[PDB]
Amino acid sequence: MADMTLRQFCERYRKGDFLAKDRETQIEAGWYDWFCDDKALAGRLAKIWGILKGITSDYILDNYRVWFKNNCPMVGPLYDDVRFEPLDEEQRDELYFGVAIDDKRREKKYVIFTARNDYENECGFNNVREVRQFINGWEDELKNEEFYKA
Amino acid sequence: LGSMADMTLRQFCERYRKGDFLAKDRETQIEAGWYDWFCDDKALAGRLAKIWGILKGITSDYILDNYRVWFKNNCPMVGPLYDDVRFEPLDEEQRDELYFGVAIDDKRREKKYVIFTARNDYENECGFNNVREVRQFINGWEDELKNEEFYK
Fold first, then answer.
1. Measured between beta carbons, which residues in chain B are less than 8 angstroms from residue A32?
2. Which of B12, B14, B135, B140 could link B57 by a cystine bridge, Cβ 3.0 to 4.6 Å?
3. 10 Å Cβ neighbour count for B65?
4. For residue A38, what is the nearest residue in chain B, using CA coordinates?
5. CA dist., res. B37 & res. B41, Å (int)
6. Would an 8 Å CB–CB cutoff place B78 in contact with chain A?
7. Contact A70/A34 with Cβ under 8 angstroms?
8. Is A90 on the interface with B (CB under 8 A)?
């Protein structure tokens, strides 16, 4: 009965707490919904951790929490997404954002949708390096004036 | 769910459009109608939105004024968590004849929305694949209670 920060999650993962494939553990890890095998969750979490292990911004690490969803589109394969929600529940409409991973309905391998963009796809990248560089710079990306000009 | 200081479904929708039931704390989500759950407490509000997609399309005054709603989140021992929304008649005596619930997005079931009714001995009757069909059912539930082809 306690919520985690992204930094706390990374601490526990580097400890390896989130490698047990059981469902009771994976619910605690952060999976909200899935269509896949319950034991696929751990492996898919490793896939997702391939991005989270490269997060450095103390703003992202200490002001955010993460949850994961596994999705079954009407056409196309199951895909996961990792969603970054701020600890301050009020500024969600401005700070929340998620990254769809390997969604074949979209051109890029990683597609980012943000609350400030009204929950639409904003940009996309084809390698993990771009995704980490973007999420780390998200604190400064919130300050780009050329965006809110909508 | 027995009963206590509960609101009617119409009263609940009135309060919900006020935004009374958007605080993610446990006391607010309990007041909204959550009876039991297995998931994170801070998910509750969000799942209520899933449920609201059904409740916001309810127009028939019979359902709105003779029923109240409570919500349960379930851990099926195998598979992911699923929710359901349960309509309880205000007169508890006719519960066995009037009560019904909608299991929403239960992965063990064929339909996205599966309806279980008290008249069918609290087992699944029918299912639908879109929220519009579910709303059409609940609004027409007053006329569905009078369909004889069932009670035979």
1. 39-40, 43
2. B135
3. 12
4. B79
5. 8
6. yes
7. yes
8. no
Q: Which of A3, A33, A89 has the CB atom closest to B80's CB atom?
A: A33
Q: Which two tokens stand for residue A81?
A: 């997404």
- Beta-strand (E) ranges in B76-119? 82-89, 100-104, 113-117
Interface with chain A: mutation pick from B24, B37, B40, B47, highest number of A CBs within 10 Å: B40
Taking an 8 Å cut-off on Cβ atoms, the answer to whether B40 and A3 are in contact is yes
Record the tokens describing residue A94, joined without a space.
Answer: 């401005």
Give the integer Cα–Cα distance in Å for B84 and B101: 7
- Rounded CA separation A4/A1 (Å): 10
Q: Is A89 on the interface with B (CB under 8 A)?
A: yes
Comparing CB atoms, the residue among A23, A27, A89 nearest residue B24 is A89
Q: Which residues contact A114 (CB under 8 A, 6 or more apart)?
A: A96, A97, A98, A120, A122
**Residue B92 backbone dihedrals phi, psi, to 5 degrees:** -65, -20
The structure tokens listed for B30 are: 């309990």
Q: Give me the residue spans of the domains in chain B.
A: 9-145
